[PDB]
Amino acid sequence: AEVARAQAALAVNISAARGLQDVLRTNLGPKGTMKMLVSGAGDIKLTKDGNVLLHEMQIQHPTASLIAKVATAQDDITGDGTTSNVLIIGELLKQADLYISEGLHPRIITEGFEAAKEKALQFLEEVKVSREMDRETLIDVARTSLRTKVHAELADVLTEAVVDSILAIKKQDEPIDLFMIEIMEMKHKSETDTSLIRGLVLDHGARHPDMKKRVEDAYILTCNVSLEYEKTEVNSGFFYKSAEEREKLVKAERKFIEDRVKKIIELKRKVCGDSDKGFVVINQKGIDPFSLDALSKEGIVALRRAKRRNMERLTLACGGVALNSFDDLSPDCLGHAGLVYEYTLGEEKFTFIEKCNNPRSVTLLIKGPNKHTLTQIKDAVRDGLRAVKNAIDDGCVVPGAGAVEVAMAEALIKHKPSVKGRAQLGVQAFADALLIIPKVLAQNSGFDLQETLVKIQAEHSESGQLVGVDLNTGEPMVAAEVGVWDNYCVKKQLLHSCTVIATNILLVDEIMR
Amino acid sequence: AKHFSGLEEAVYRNIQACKELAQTTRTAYGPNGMNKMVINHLEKLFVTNDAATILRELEVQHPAAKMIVMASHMQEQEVGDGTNFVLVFAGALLELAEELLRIGLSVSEVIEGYEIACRKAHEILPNLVCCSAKNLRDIDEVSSLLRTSIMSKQYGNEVFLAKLIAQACVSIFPDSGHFNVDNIRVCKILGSGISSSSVLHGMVFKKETEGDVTSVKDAKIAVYSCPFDGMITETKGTVLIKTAEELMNFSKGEENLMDAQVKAIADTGANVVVTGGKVADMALHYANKYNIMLVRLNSKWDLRRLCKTVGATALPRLTPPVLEEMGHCDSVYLSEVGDTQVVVFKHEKEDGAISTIVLRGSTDNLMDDIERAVDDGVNTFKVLTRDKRLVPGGGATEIELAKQITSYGETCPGLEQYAIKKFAEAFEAIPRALAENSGVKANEVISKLYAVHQEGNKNVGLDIEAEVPAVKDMLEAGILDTYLGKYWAIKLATNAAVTVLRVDQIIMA
Amino acid sequence: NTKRESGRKVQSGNINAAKTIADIIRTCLGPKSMMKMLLDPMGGIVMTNDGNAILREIQVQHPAAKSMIEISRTQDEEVGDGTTSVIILAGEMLSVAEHFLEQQMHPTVVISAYRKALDDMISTLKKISIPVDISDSDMMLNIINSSITTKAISRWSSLACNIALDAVKMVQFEENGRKEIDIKKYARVEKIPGGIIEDSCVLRGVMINKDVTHPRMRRYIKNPRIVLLDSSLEYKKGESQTDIEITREEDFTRILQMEEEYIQQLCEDIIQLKPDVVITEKGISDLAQHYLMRANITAIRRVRKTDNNRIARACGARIVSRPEELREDDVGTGAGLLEIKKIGDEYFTFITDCKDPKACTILLRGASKEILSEVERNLQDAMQVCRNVLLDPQLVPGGGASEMAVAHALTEKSKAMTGVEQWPYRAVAQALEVIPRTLIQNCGASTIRLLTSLRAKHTQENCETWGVNGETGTLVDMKELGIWEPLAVKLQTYKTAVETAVLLLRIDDIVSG
C-alpha cells in the first residue's frame, strides 16, 4: 500500500530527530536557558531539563516516540544529562547522514558507531578517576550537575542543600535517594525559596496552644482511622437509609469519639507520662471536635492530615511505626522522632518529626506564591539530588565541562580503524558527536562554539591539559581542576543511551503509513 | 491559542505583552491615575487606574503577559504603590532585549545584567529614599502619605479619602504600628456625595435589619446563612404557596418554629441572629416579639464580611451554634452608615482589623474609584507600618538610578555593559509615562531631571503645570513613595521581567 | 458479485506487494539487518525484522500479500521458522520472471520452471549439504545456534541450544511414531515467567502448570499418579435446581453455589482415596479444590483427557475409578523427573519425560518474565534444528552461497535443459542470488563482483559449503565460518516460495464475491 522505504524514508526521521534536538540547544547549562513548556493545563513549565520538556508536550514525530525513552532512561539511570543525550545523537546523525549522503551504507555507518563508543567508553574509563564522595567534592559535582540540568543561580542555592540531603545517608548504595526526597512546598513571599530539613515533616498538623507547642520526647501515634471510631484499624459502617437506624447512629458515635480520645489520653499518661513528655497524635483523617481540644489539653498534640507518605517516612525516619489507631500500646510502636515540632509557615502547618532514628527521610520545604516558579525550583531540586547522589554513591566521578569530549575525539585518532573505513566513519562521525556539548556551551557562550573548541583541542592536545569550554564565559579552562564534574555514571550510561537510538535510526530504513 | 514555534514565543509574544503593559499604567499611573472602562462577564462599566485590578479583570492569553500579572498582585498585596509601575518598568526593561537581540546578546547574559543591576539598584534605593514620616496614631500624617499613595492610583478627591483611609487604619488598630491584610470593610452604598463616604469601626450589615432589639449593648451573633423563613438546608420547611389552607397552618407554626429556631440560636446565645437566608413574617413577627435581631437575607458578602471578622462560621443548616459558630461584636446599634439606615456593629476593642467604611460615591464607578484608591491606602499604611522610609514621587528616583546604572554599566565591561546600561533606561519610562499622562515628553523631563542633576527628589509630577513640563521637589510636594514601595516594585518587576525572558518556545503537536 | 480482472495488471499487482514486502526484510534477515518500522496513524512506531508482523498491523493488499502471510505462516507453521525467507524468495521469482517471460510470452514454463528450479535446490543442496552428528549436542549446537540467530539473537542461542539439544530427541508423539520431525504439541515450548537464567533447567517432557498450582497441594511426590474421575469423582456436573422461595435471601446465593459443592462432595469422595494427583476434564471448582489440597493431594483441573493421557503415560499415572477400586491401574512411573518450580506462589510442575507421549513441553527461564518470549522463539528455532538435524544431518552451509548454489547450478543446467524452457529456467536462475548478495551489499563494495567472485568461486571452488560470508562478505567455507542453513529450511523455503509464485501467475483475476 503506502510504504516509505530506504534512503528517502529515513530522511524524515533524521530530519525530525536532528530538527527536534536543535531546540534543546537552548538548554544544557547556564548559558542555555530553561525552556518554557505549556500544556492543556496552560501551565508554563520552565525546565532546562530535557526529560521534563520531552515527555509532556511536543510535535508528533516517529522519532518523538523513541526520544521519549532515552531522556527518561538517563533520568532513570542518573537524574542528570537528560538534556545532554539528545544533542549528541543528531550531531552523530548529521555526521552519519553525510556518509549516507555519500551513499555509504547506513549499515556500514551503523556498524562503526559501536567500537567508537567503546573507544570513548574505555577512554572515559581512562579520563575518569576515583574522586571523593566528600560533600565539598559533591559541591564540585553539585554545582556542575545542577547547571547542565537546572539553573546556575538555582544550582548555587541548591548546591549546599542538595548535597546535604544526599549526605544524610547511612551510606546507602542507592544512586538516587527515595526518602532523602521529601518535598514540602508553599505559597510564600519568595517565588523561589527552599528550606533544608533533615527528618520528616508532616503535610498538615493541628496546632493548638492547648497542645504542646514543643514536643521534645515525641511518641507519635500516626493513625489513618481517626478519633471518630473506637478501637478500630478499620472504619465502621454507616446506615443513613432509614430513620431508626440513623436515629441510633448519631448518639453512639460520641462513644466511638470518647473512647478514642480516651485511648490516647490514658495512653499518653502511659506512654508519654502525664505532662512528663509531649505526646503526638497524627490524624491522617479529620480530628474529632471533642477529641481535637480534648487531645489538645491533655498534652497530646493531635495532628490533622499526615499523608501515607508521611506515614511511611516517619516510621522509617523516627524508627517507630504508624498505627491505624489510638488504642493503648507501648511507646516504641508509636513513632518517636527526637523532636516533633509543628512549624506553621504560610497557611500550611508543617509538623516536623525531627531528630529521627533514621535520617533517611529528609525534607525540603519549597516556596513560592507563583506556581511556575514553585514548579521550576521544586523541580530544580530533584535532578541534583539524583545527579549529585551519583557523585556520593560512586567513588569515581567523571570530569565535566566537556573537557573529556575534546579529549576522546583526538584519542579516537583514526586508522586506528584501519579495518574498513566504515568503522573509520563510525569513529569519525562519533568523534564529532562527542563535541556537541563543548560546542553548545561555547555556542551558548560568547565567541565561537568552534574557535574555542578547536582552541580546546589544540590546547587539550598539548600535554597535561584536560581542558574545556567554560559553561559560562565559554573560555578554555581545565575542567577537573575547577571541580566542575558531571556524575561518573552519566557519561558511560550517556554514551550507551546516545548511540543506541542513533544506531536504531539507521536500522530503520522503512516507515509505512 | 498558546503553543507556537518559530521564535513567536520570545521576540513576539513577549513584546506584545509589553504593549499591554502600556496604558494600564502609562496614563493610569504617576502621582495620579487615569480611568479605563471595564465591561464585565455580566456586563457593566468599570473605570480603573491601578494595573493589577484591571489586568486581573482582563483574562490574558499570553503566557508571557500571564506571568507578570502575578507579580503585580504580589506587589499590590505586599505594596500597592507602583502596582501600575511593575508593568511599565518590566516592559521598558524587556523591550531592551530585541535590540540586544539585533546586537546579538544572550538571554543568559542580559538576565544577569539587569539582575546585578537591580541588585545594584536595590542598593541605591535607600539613599533616594528621602527622609521619612510615620505616625500611625496620626490620621493626618498617614493621610498625606496615603494621599499620594492613593493618588498615584487615584485621580479624585485625594485628601478626603486619605483622611478616611488614614482614619480607619489609624483608628481601627489601637496597636497601629502594625497593619493586617484586611483591616477595613467597606459597605458600598450609593447616593448623597462622595464626601458622604464615612469611616465606621465595626461590622456594617448594609442589609435590612429586623427583630426588635433586646440588647443594642452587646452584639453576640450566632451567624447564619440559614433561612429563618422556616427553611433549614438539610431538610427544608419551605412555605407552601400552592394552597391557602396549608399556608394557614404553617404560618401559625412559623411563630413557634421560629421559636424553636431563635432559641437554638440564642440558647448558646445571640444578640443579633445574623440571617443570610430568607425570613418569614410569622418568623419575624415572633422574632420581633421574641426580641432577637434578624439582619435578614444578608448579602453573602456581608455574610463573608461577618464570617471573617467575628471569627465565626455561618450555619447554612439550622442547628445549635457552638463557640466556633457564634460571632461576637462590641455593639449592635442600628444606625445610618453614610446616612443609610442599617445595622452597624463596633469592632475596635473586640478584635480590630475591621473598620467598616461606607463608600458613598455618586456613581458605582466613583464608588469603585474610592474603592480603587484605598487599595493602596490599605497597603501603603501596611507599608507605612513596615517602613516610614519615604521616597519622593516617582521619576526623581529613577534618574539617579540611571546615572548610577549607566556608569555602573561602563564599569561592567563584557556584554552586560550593554544590558546594565539598558537597565538604566527602563527607569526613564516612568517620567515618560508621567509625561505621557500629563501630555509631554520624557526627553525634556529627562533633560530637566538631569539638568538640576537631582536625582531622587526633584521631578515633574503628574501636573497641570506640566503644560510646560516642569520639575518640582517631589518629597516636599507631598507626592511621595517609600523604600519598599520602590524596592519591591523594582524587585518584582525585574524578576517577572527576567524570568519571562528565560522562557522558550513550546513544542506542541 | 461477478467481477473480472485480467492479464499483467493483476500479476503486476502480484509483483508489487510481495516484492515491496521483500525489500526491508531481506535487508533485515540474516546477520546484516535493518528494521521495518510501521507508522501508526497516531505516529506509533513498530519496528521489527518480521514484515508479517508489520503487514498485519496495516492493510494487507489482496493480490500478493494475502497469499504471502499464509506462505509466511506455512513455513513457520512447518519448521517453526522462515516467515521472512519465503516472502523475499517468492518475491525474487515473482519479480523478474513473468513480465520478462510473458514478454517472451508463456505462463507455462514459468510455472514449470518453479518445479525444475526447485529440485535443483533439492539436487545441489543434499549433495553439498554437510552431515552433522545428531547424537552430539555440539555438532547440533553449531547448526542450531546458526538457526537460533534467525534475526539478531545468539544471546539465548547457547541456552536455547542446550534445552532443544536435549528435548527434541526425547520428543515422541502419543503415537510415538517418530521422534525427529514433530508437531509442536509433541514438542512444546512454554515460557515460564520470572526467575533467572539458572532456572532455565532443561525440561525434556511435558509440563503441567496445573499439576501443582498451590503450596497446599501435593509436595514433590516423585511419581505423580493422576486418578481420572470415574469413581474418585463420581459423576455429578448438574445442579439440585431447588424450588424458589421468597422468604430467604440466601436461596438466591445458595442455588448457584450448589454447582461447585457437588465436586466438593466428589472431592470429599477423592480425599478418602488420596490420589496423589487428581485430573478432571469436567473440571473441579476451587471451592471443591480446597479439600484436595489439604490432603496433600494436588489437583490438575480443567485439563482434557489427552493432555492427561499423554501425561498419565508420561508421568506414568494409574488411571482408575478409585485408587482402591480397580479400573486396571496404569503404571506407577513413566518419568524420571518431577520438578515443581515456583516463581511466586503459583507453582509450575515440570515432569521431564524420556521418550514418552507427553507434550515435550520444555522449561525455559529468562532473566525475567519477558525475554522468555525470545527464548521460546530461540528454542522453537532451536528445536527446529533438533527436529531438522535428527531429520537431516546434512544441511547446507552458506552465506547464501546456497542461495547462489542453486542459482549457478541452474544456469549450468540452463545450458543443459535448453529449449525455450532454459530462458525461464535461466531467468529464474537469477532470482536466487539476490538475497545473500543484498546481505553482502548490506556489506558494501561491489556485491555483484563478490557475486561474480561467488560465481567464480561457485563452480570452481564450491557451491555453498565453501561460500561467501553473509555479514562480512568474504568468500569462506560456511561450515568453516560455522554459518548453517538447514537443508529442510532451504528445502522448505523455495518449495514454499515456488508454490505461491506459481499461483500468483495463475491468478490474473479476482472477484468481489
UniProtKB/Swiss-Prot annotation, chain A:
Cross-link position per record: Glycyl lysine isopeptide (Lys-Gly) (interchain with G-Cter in SUMO2): 241
Residues bound to ATP: 29, 81-83, 401-402, 486, 491
Coarse class of the protein's main subcellular location: cytoplasm
Binding site for ADP: 29, 81-84, 148-149, 401, 486
Keyword Cell cycle: no
Gene Ontology annotations of biological process type: chaperone mediated protein folding independent of cofactor; chaperone-mediated protein folding; positive regulation of establishment of protein localization to telomere; positive regulation of protein localization to Cajal body; positive regulation of telomerase RNA localization to Cajal body; positive regulation of telomere maintenance via telomerase; protein folding; protein stabilization
Subcellular location per the Swiss-Prot or TrEMBL entry: Cytoplasm
Keywords, sorted A to Z: Acetylation, ATP-binding, Chaperone, Cytoplasm, Hydrolase, Isopeptide bond, Nucleotide-binding, Phosphoprotein, Ubl conjugation
Entry-annotated residues carrying N6-acetyllysine: 189, 277, 355, 367, 378
Reaction catalysed by this enzyme: ATP + H2O = ADP + phosphate + H(+)
GO cellular component: chaperonin-containing T-complex; cytoplasm; cytosol; extracellular exosome; microtubule
Binding residues annotated for Mg(2+), in chain numbering: 80
Enzyme class: hydrolase
InterPro entries to which the protein is assigned, alphabetical: Chap_CCT_zeta (IPR012722), Chaperone_TCP-1 (IPR017998), Chaperonin_TCP-1_CS (IPR002194), Cpn60/GroEL/TCP-1 (IPR002423), GroEL-like_apical_dom_sf (IPR027409), GROEL-like_equatorial_sf (IPR027413), TCP-1-like_intermed_sf (IPR027410), TCP-1_chaperonin (IPR053374)
Phosphoserine, modified sites: 195
UniProt superkingdom: Eukaryota
EC number: 3.6.1.-
UniProt cross-references to Pfam families, sorted A to Z: Cpn60_TCP1
The keyword Calcium appears for this protein: no
GO MF: ATP binding; ATP hydrolysis activity; ATP-dependent protein folding chaperone; protein folding chaperone; RNA binding; unfolded protein binding; WD40-repeat domain binding
Family: Belongs to the TCP-1 chaperonin family.
Record disease entry: De novo genetic variants in nearly every subunit of the TRiC complex, including CCT6A, have been found in individuals with a broad spectrum of brain malformations, and clinical phenotypes ranging from mild to severe epilepsy, developmental delay, intellectual disability, ataxia, and other features of cerebral malfunction.
The protein's name in its UniProt record: T-complex protein 1 subunit zeta
Lineage: Eukaryota, Metazoa, Chordata, Craniata, Vertebrata
From Swiss-Prot, chain B:
Residues annotated as binding ATP: 82-84, 152-153, 394, 481, 486
Keyword Acetylation: yes
Gene Ontology biological process: binding of sperm to zona pellucida; chaperone mediated protein folding independent of cofactor; chaperone-mediated protein folding; positive regulation of protein localization to Cajal body; positive regulation of telomerase RNA localization to Cajal body; positive regulation of telomere maintenance via telomerase; protein folding; protein stabilization
Covalent cross-link (Glycyl lysine isopeptide (Lys-Gly) (interchain with G-Cter in SUMO1)), residues: 441
UniProt keyword annotations, A-Z: Acetylation, ATP-binding, Cell projection, Chaperone, Cilium, Cytoplasm, Cytoskeleton, Hydrolase, Isopeptide bond, Nucleotide-binding, Phosphoprotein, Ubl conjugation
CDD domains: TCP1_theta
Phosphoserine carried by residues: 5, 144, 195, 251, 299
Superkingdom per UniProt: Eukaryota
GO CC, alphabetical: azurophil granule lumen; cell body; centrosome; chaperonin-containing T-complex; cilium; cytoplasm; cytosol; extracellular exosome
Subcellular location: Cytoplasm; Cytoplasm, Cytoskeleton, Microtubule organizing center, Centrosome; Cytoplasm, Cytoskeleton, Cilium basal body
Annotated positions of the N6-acetyllysine modification: 300, 382, 448
Residues the record lists as binding Mg(2+): 81
Cross-link (Glycyl lysine isopeptide (Lys-Gly) (interchain with G-Cter in SUMO2)): 206, 236, 242
Enzyme Commission number, as recorded: 3.6.1.-
Enzyme class: hydrolase
Reaction catalyzed: ATP + H2O = ADP + phosphate + H(+)
Molecular function terms, GO-annotated: ATP binding; ATP hydrolysis activity; ATP-dependent protein folding chaperone; cadherin binding; protein folding chaperone; unfolded protein binding
Binding site for ADP: 29-30, 82-85, 151-153, 394, 481
Phosphotyrosine, modified sites: 12, 487
Name of a matching Pfam family: Cpn60_TCP1
PANTHER family: CHAPERONIN
Assembly behavior: Component of the chaperonin-containing T-complex (TRiC), a hexadecamer composed of two identical back-to-back stacked rings enclosing a protein folding chamber. Each ring is made up of eight different subunits: TCP1/CCT1, CCT2, CCT3, CCT4, CCT5, CCT6A/CCT6, CCT7, CCT8. Interacts with PACRG. Interacts with DNAAF4. Interacts with synaptic plasticity regulator PANTS.
Family, similarity comment: Belongs to the TCP-1 chaperonin family.
Protein name: T-complex protein 1 subunit theta
Protein species of origin: Homo sapiens (Human)
Organism lineage string: Eukaryota, Metazoa, Chordata, Craniata, Vertebrata
Designated gene of the protein: CCT8
Swiss-Prot record, chain C:
Cross-link Glycyl lysine isopeptide (Lys-Gly) (interchain with G-Cter in SUMO2): where in chain: 3, 236-237, 369
UniProt keywords, alphabetically: Acetylation, ATP-binding, Chaperone, Cytoplasm, Disease variant, Disulfide bond, Hydrolase, Intellectual disability, Isopeptide bond, Nucleotide-binding, Phosphoprotein, Ubl conjugation
Membrane as UniProt keyword: no
Modified residues (Phosphothreonine): 418, 447
Coiled coil segments of this chain: none
Reactions catalysed: ATP + H2O = ADP + phosphate + H(+)
Residues bearing the modification Phosphoserine: 158, 231-232, 240
InterPro entries in the record: Chap_CCT_gamma (IPR012719), Chaperone_TCP-1 (IPR017998), Chaperonin_TCP-1_CS (IPR002194), Cpn60/GroEL/TCP-1 (IPR002423), GroEL-like_apical_dom_sf (IPR027409), GROEL-like_equatorial_sf (IPR027413), TCP-1-like_intermed_sf (IPR027410), TCP-1_chaperonin (IPR053374)
PROSITE patterns (UniProt xref): TCP1_1, TCP1_2, TCP1_3
Residues binding Mg(2+): 81
GO-annotated cellular components: cell body; chaperonin-containing T-complex; cytoskeleton; cytosol; extracellular exosome; microtubule; zona pellucida receptor complex
Annotated GO biological process: binding of sperm to zona pellucida; chaperone mediated protein folding independent of cofactor; chaperone-mediated protein folding; positive regulation of protein localization to Cajal body; positive regulation of telomerase RNA localization to Cajal body; positive regulation of telomere maintenance via telomerase; protein folding; protein stabilization
Residues that hold ADP according to the record: 30, 82-85, 150-151, 399, 470-471, 485, 490
Compartment(s): Cytoplasm
Keyword Electron transport carried by entry: no
SS bonds (residue pairs): 354-360
Primary location recorded for the protein, binned into one broad class: cytoplasm
Chain sites annotated for binding ATP: 30, 82-84, 399, 470, 485
Disease: Neurodevelopmental disorder with speech or visual impairment and brain hypomyelination: An autosomal dominant disorder characterized by global developmental delay, impaired intellectual development, poor or absent speech, and brain abnormalities including hypomyelination, cerebellar atrophy, and optic nerve atrophy. Some patients have severe visual impairment, dystonic movements, and seizures.
Family: Belongs to the TCP-1 chaperonin family.
Name this polypeptide is given: T-complex protein 1 subunit gamma
